[PDB]
């Protein structure tokens, strides 16, 4: 009869037909990953081809239902998800050219040698532990001069092809296509816009500049001791001394920048070894931690089907920590586990992912995913955040029950956390701003590197050691840039993580500093979380966010409240040192 009723019938048929195909494709993928042979690759390729062909045909079928007729707002979401054209709007020759460009860029990034040394792990070890100016400069410059020079011509055609594809789908540019994820419309009082994500990110960043400036000044003052005359007390930090190839993470700078080096950290690896933990107690303890909050247990097949240890010498597998949701009520974890603290925290992270995947399994097929990009990883991360506290360790049994907690230990812990969390927001913000500007056409093709380095000096406070001409492509050296991955999901995730943590700690009635908060043995926090987890993609991300923190937008105040002792100590320490950087100074 009406368009809505026919759409509902079509959606029933599609869901029933699609669940089994997705399950079979996932089974083939798991079979290849656990057992690497030449037979399994063909099975993966065939299953993927079948699934892709089915999805394309069903999208073409679903395009026939006009979207103005449906007013249910839940049928409309699934029809909108199916109706997306994608890159098929391009001509056959243009599509082949775009796919060839992407494959060539990925292949050339993957196969890169410096003469020889590969990036993994020959160059990474040099950039992580050289402690020598000349060697670090050579390693930093050679990789750029090879890859960025070899990748510059391809990116220029990539940009215009992607812009044509995005403008064909009624968007302004490809950056607008990326921003379309954070969009809510048709709901009164919870609206959001693609152009509103340009704002609400700058606003959040202008509230982080004091803390980052103090951290940068402290790190520069501490790093000046290692290299006597290569760093200026008013200039920026050279790009090849930040403990990374790109400077994305400052974690490797922890060894030089320790507040109190005499006092060690909390490492419970020896306690785990002496108590004879054997890669199965870790996941049982994680399950206990998740149950104590009120969330359910692991399913019966999770224990027997999943892989929690290396296959052995005879069987080879690519075992990175991963949580698999194969469909039809099948959840597993693929991971090689050894007895350390890092694996103990990764178990909680992966089970946070798994418990997120269990909640919205009652939603239709197309609405079984997180509310937006940052919700899934933030939910995963808060569990690992709460499971590492000394109180939680003492309650479990590992770490002595008469541990001495003082100011020095918490300052060391907070600095180690901020060298990873705070030190990466400016990089993400600057890189995504540059990509958006390039896509929008505001940056001309002849002023790419100049604008990139000017933005890096003005925002990140980092200068280049040697000048780079327009034949270089420094941004393409990053894995995400050349491999076509969105990068703003590492900003909203960081903000949502602390918003969720503060809301849950307010639900658990914890008194004191936020960084000592623990969420175990509390069921109200579990209910508050599960009210949002079960929603899936059915409700707007603003509404799902409101169910935990009570706000319709992301805030930076929890992030600054987490790091208050560190901010006060840094402000005390930087009384003599200069705060801020000057863009005129250069190493040459």
């Amino acid at each position: 009869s009406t368009i809505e009723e026919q759409a509902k019938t079509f959606l029933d048929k599609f869901n029933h037909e699609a669940e089994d195909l997705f399950y079979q494709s996932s089974l083939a993928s798991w079979n290849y990953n656990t057992n690497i042979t030449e037979e399994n690759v063909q099975n993966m390729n065939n299953a993927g081809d079948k699934w892709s062909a089915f999805l394309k045909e069903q999208s073409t079928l679903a395009q026939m239902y006009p979207l103005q007729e449906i007013q249910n707002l839940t049928v409309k979401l699934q029809l909108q998800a199916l109706q997306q054209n994608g890159s098929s709007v391009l001509s056959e020759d243009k599509s082949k050219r775009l796919n060839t460009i992407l494959n060539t860029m990925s292949t050339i990034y993957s196969t890169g040698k410096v003469c020889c040394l590969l990036l993994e792990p020959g160059l990474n070890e040099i950039m992580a532990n050289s402690l020598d100016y000349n060697e670090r400069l050579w390693a930093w410059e050679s990789w750029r001069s090879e890859v960025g020079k070899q990748l510059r011509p391809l990116y220029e055609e990539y940009v215009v092809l992607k812009n044509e594809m995005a403008r064909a789908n009624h968007y302004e540019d490809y950056g607008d296509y990326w921003r379309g994820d954070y969009e809510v419309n048709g709901v009164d009082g919870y609206d959001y816009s693609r152009g509103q994500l340009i704002e609400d990110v700058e606003h959040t960043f202008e509230e982080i500049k004091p803390l980052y400036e103090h951290l940068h000044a402290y790190v520069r003052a501490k790093l000046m001791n290692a290299y006597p005359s290569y760093i200026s007390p008013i200039g920026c930090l050279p790009a090849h001394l930040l403990g990374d190839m790109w400077g994305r993470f400052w974690t490797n700078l922890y060894s030089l920048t320790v507040p109190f080096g005499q006092k060690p950290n909390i490492d419970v690896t020896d306690a785990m070894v002496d108590q004879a933990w054997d890669a199965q107690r870790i996941f049982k303890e994680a399950e206990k931690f998740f149950v104590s909050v009120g969330l359910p247990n692991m399913t019966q097949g999770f224990w027997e089907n999943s892989m929690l240890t290396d296959p052995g010498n005879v069987q080879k597998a690519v075992c990175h920590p991963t949580a698999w949701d194969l469909g039809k009520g099948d959840f597993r974890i693929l991971m090689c586990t050894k007895v350390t603290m890092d694996d103990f925290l990764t178990a909680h992270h992966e089970m946070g992912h798994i418990q997120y995947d269990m909640a919205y399994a009652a939603q239709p097929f197309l609405l079984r995913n997180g509310a937006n990009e940052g919700f899934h990883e933030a939910v995963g991360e808060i569990m690992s955040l709460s499971a590492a506290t000394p109180k939680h360790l003492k309650s479990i049994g590992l770490l002595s029950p008469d541990f001495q907690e003082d100011n020095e230990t918490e300052i060391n812990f907070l600095l180690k956390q901020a060298l990873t969390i705070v030190g990466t927001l400016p990089f993400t913000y600057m890189l995504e701003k540059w990509r958006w500007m390039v896509f929008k056409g505001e940056i001309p093709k002849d002023q790419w590197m100049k604008k990139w380095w000017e933005m890096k000096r003005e925002i990140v406070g980092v200068v280049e050691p040697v000048p780079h001409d327009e034949t270089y492509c420094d941004p393409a050296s990053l894995f995400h840039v050349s491999n076509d991955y969105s990068f703003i999901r590492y900003y909203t995730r960081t903000l949502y993580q602390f918003q969720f943590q503060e809301a849950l700690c307010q639900a658990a009635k914890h008194e004191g500093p936020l960084h000592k908060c623990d969420i175990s043995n509390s069921t109200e926090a579990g209910q508050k979380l599960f009210n949002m987890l079960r929603l899936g993609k059915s409700e707007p991300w603003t509404l799902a966010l409101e169910n935990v923190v009570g706000a319709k937008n992301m805030n930076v105040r929890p992030l600054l409240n987490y790091f208050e002792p560190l901010f006060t100590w840094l402000k005390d320490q930087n009384k003599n040192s200069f705060v801020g950087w000057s863009t005129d100074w250069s190493p040459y």
Binding site: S1, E5, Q6, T9, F10, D12, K13, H16, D20, Y23, L27, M64, T299, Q300, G301, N305, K328, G329, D330
Partner: protein, 251 residues
């Protein structure tokens, strides 16, 4: 109340519960089997205490009492469904199975038994041998079976017998694998319906019957209904064995 007497028919054959429950192959839910079991003595105590059933829910009867009641007829309906759909096998519920596949009336007297079958109906790859009806114009009336395979039309355009745009084949298959969840695993369901009519009772429990007395005030239990009084050969009960008619008199 000097004596107590109970009178039941002298049937000795055992009911074929094993043939229904121990069956080699079951049936699709859209085309479910019906078996009538009669002229036998039924012992539901062993069936209840077998303790191998995930679901044993009796509506309108008591689980222990029904052992000594006499029913005119007993019907058993057997099929296979998904683990999550067993919820819909109950009076006054809605769903794809309770609307288009199998409907139980609200005034239902009987029992529902369901047990897991993952070790028999699941194979590597997939079963794809158990179907169920997905589309239908109208809901199924209680205890009605539909086995037509006509093409369902969703729009105004006529189907002309070949599927296409807004033309679907209703019967879609169940896919069972040994790695699924509990809610996606096969379950075998047997529904027992007890029918009482004005005809003499035929299916009864295993309760021994004693001799009858007359002209004295005794407690009698005929074919399930009890009373106290004097039985006189002639408010009126007809005993099963000796075909006599007795009148009940207050004492």
């Amino acid at each position: 109340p000097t004596e107590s007497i109970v009178r039941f028919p002298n049937i000795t054959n055992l009911c074929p519960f094993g043939e229904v429950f121990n069956a080699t192959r079951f049936a699709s839910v859209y085309a479910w089997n019906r078996k009538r079991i009669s002229n036998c003595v039924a012992d539901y105590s062993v069936l209840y205490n077998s303790a191998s059933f995930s679901t044993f829910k009796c509506y309108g009867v008591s689980p222990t009492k029904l052992n000594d009641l006499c029913f005119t007829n007993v019907y058993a309906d057997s099929f296979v469904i998904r683990g999550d759909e067993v919820r819909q096998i109950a009076p006054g519920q809605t769903g794809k199975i309770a609307d288009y596949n199998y409907k139980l009336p609200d005034d239902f007297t009987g029992c529902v038994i369901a047990w897991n079958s993952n070790n028999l109906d699941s194979k590597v790859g997939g079963n794809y041998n158990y179907l169920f009806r997905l589309f239908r114009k109208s809901n199924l009336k209680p205890f009605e079976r539909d086995i037509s395979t006509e093409i369902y039309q969703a729009g105004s355009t006529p189907c002309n017998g070949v599927e296409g745009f807004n033309c679907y084949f209703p019967l879609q298959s169940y896919g069972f694998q040994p790695t699924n969840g509990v809610g996606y695993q096969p379950y075998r369901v047997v529904v027992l319906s007890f029918e009482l009519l004005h005809a003499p009772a035929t299916v009864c429990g295993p309760k021994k019957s004693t001799n009858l007395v007359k002209n004295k005030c005794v407690n009698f239990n005929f074919n399930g209904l009890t009373g106290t009084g004097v039985l006189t050969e002639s408010d009126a009960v007809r005993d099963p064995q000796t075909l006599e008619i007795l009148d009940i008199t207050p004492c």
